[PDB]
Design a protein around this ligand. Sequence first.
Ligand SMILES: CC1=CC(=O)CC(C)(C)[C@@]1(O)/C=C/C(C)=C\C(=O)O
Ligand SMILES: CC1=CC(=O)CC(C)(C)[C@@]1(O)/C=C/C(C)=C\C(=O)O
Lengths: 174, 180, 175, 176
Amino acid sequence: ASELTPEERSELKNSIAEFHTYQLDPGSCSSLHAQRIHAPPELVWSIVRRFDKPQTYKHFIKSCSVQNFMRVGCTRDVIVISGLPANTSTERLDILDDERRVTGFSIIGGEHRLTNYKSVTTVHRFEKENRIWTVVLESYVVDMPEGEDDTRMFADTVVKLNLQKLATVAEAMA
Amino acid sequence: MASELTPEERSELKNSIAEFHTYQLDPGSCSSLHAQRIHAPPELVWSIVRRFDKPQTYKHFIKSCSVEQNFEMRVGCTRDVIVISGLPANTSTERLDILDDERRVTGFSIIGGEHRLTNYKSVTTVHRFEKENRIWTVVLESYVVDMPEGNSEDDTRMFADTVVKLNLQKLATVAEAMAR
Amino acid sequence: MASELTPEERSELKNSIAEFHTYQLDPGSCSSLHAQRIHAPPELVWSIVRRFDKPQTYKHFIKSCSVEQNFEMRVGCTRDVIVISGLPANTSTERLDILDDERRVTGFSIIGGEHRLTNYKSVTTVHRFEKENRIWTVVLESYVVDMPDDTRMFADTVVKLNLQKLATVAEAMAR
Amino acid sequence: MASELTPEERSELKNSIAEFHTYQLDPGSCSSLHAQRIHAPPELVWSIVRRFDKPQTYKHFIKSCSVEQNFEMRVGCTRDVIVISGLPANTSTERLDILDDERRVTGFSIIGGEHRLTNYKSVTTVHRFEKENRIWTVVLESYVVDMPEDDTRMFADTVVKLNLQKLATVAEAMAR
Ligand SMILES: CC1=CC(=O)CC(C)(C)[C@@]1(O)/C=C/C(C)=C\C(=O)O
Ligand SMILES: CC1=CC(=O)CC(C)(C)[C@@]1(O)/C=C/C(C)=C\C(=O)O
């Protein structure tokens, strides 16, 4: 399910080059994750695109606040409860292309400020012999740790798990 | 749907729920119960669940686990759990409270480790279902914890619920894969 | 990160990062980029860096490195690196991917051995800086590996320490 | 050069070397001694080195370390060291063998955890140098491990040197 076929990988190469390839600052790193979803890509995109409702697919979110709300440069506050004194994160919508199904955001303030976290998600339609399905790609770039508590392992784990929830939610909707 | 019991499942499980997963709460404490359907034999699921020395086999977030040398699994034995960074705690020392191989019940209590969970105690029970010719499992897990001094700090329950739910999902994925 | 690169250094390195240190990732992999400033001439640093047969000069945890007898360095050649960071010493077979003496770029892939499954590939570049008559060096080293048991924090740590050893060595030599 | 003693340093240190860093080795065991010059006051260096509960302050490769709650630092106390992945161990439990604040000497033995370093015992001594009206520190650290051997010795030597290098860096940053 996170393991793409060679057919899928060839089809995704141009999108990876375009949206998921970062020019790194020294002291940073990037990861790319994939998730196959047995649902139509318009349905998956309808969930993914909702900047105000990350809790639908992401774990560890208490709440998300944005009022009479969606545009590039919009911000959200995500209260997360993966920290037990609940933490707030301020995130900005960097990209939103409904025709090409691309969105992304950056963490611009709050507890994980020093991470310079930036992420992009793309949604992709596959069709083989009357069967239609979806692949989601999600990549991020983050600063590497300077100063004991590196959370990049946790960042990868959570993306993986989040994408797994997205597949579950979307497949149950379909 | 994997985490939501059918009426037939919850009818059959009433007595188990009353015996192991029903709590009369003190002030400053919270509990919750989670269910997880697994398409695998209960004896296989139980063989994973009972391994007190290997929680990493079915739990996320565990870097490693150590137990005493010449480990004999008996109630009262402890394990030292090492978690990955990014979480409210990086270690947990846990005590085996119950190990009943006949009835398929375990449970543990968090004794120590630096974290925000105080007096956490959980119980896991494993249940056989058979219909027509098919066999499947339901796992129930409940916990009680002390909630912090923020009054109804729903943060603690929200955090533990997520972890427990994710760990039950992994248990299902692991047992199912093993069944194949 | 030697300590941190200046805005001027970063600006000057943009083009090299784009050319040599940006990877088109496979799903399930990650890439990381480290820098080290070195107060020594670039030709000196490169003379150490380019020696595929002698990684032990700048890298940690190497028991030995062996190559072909009468070694002639060119792309496609391999080395066996016995590493001691595992206590039942492990061996790594690594392939020289790039060598450009004119532009000071080299890189290798792990093709066999204990961490063969990681699909590790790394690139090192050496850069000359001159401002107001002092001359110095920045080294960039990047890698890509599959994500898994997760030894990638060790991989970043060891790259950082290795670059620190390169700086210490080259700076001593320049004296 | 910082890991390399001068003849004047080693001559003064002959006494300390003989007392703490010289070994009568049972077969199947090996020992090694390392040195690190630190341009910082020995009291600062000792204040870091003596902190049995905080080895991450000067050691590489440590994810975390815990000591029993309400810990008081005395010979016989233990710590549980958690190490990042990629190395021969996940964990190490270590016992404080020596803690002499007057003479600036500690040491510890590994008594458990899963790795390949059985009966590892090390001793660390911190030394003052003055000559003349200019002050620096030399740290000596030696260990005895029994092997399953160049490999065991090469590994431990690597860690010890790296850790001494960090100690020097961290101390020198604090002195600034
Ligand atoms: C993953 C993690 C993070 C923490 O902050 C607390 C603790 C370390 C105990 C924990 O292991 C939590 C474990 C829980 C809730 C349940 C379990 O294990 O059945
Ligand atoms: C870094 C590491 C890797 C291991 O495999 C063993 C162990 C966990 C003991 C260790 O902490 C080793 C520590 C050593 C040699 C010395 C020290 O700490 O003074």
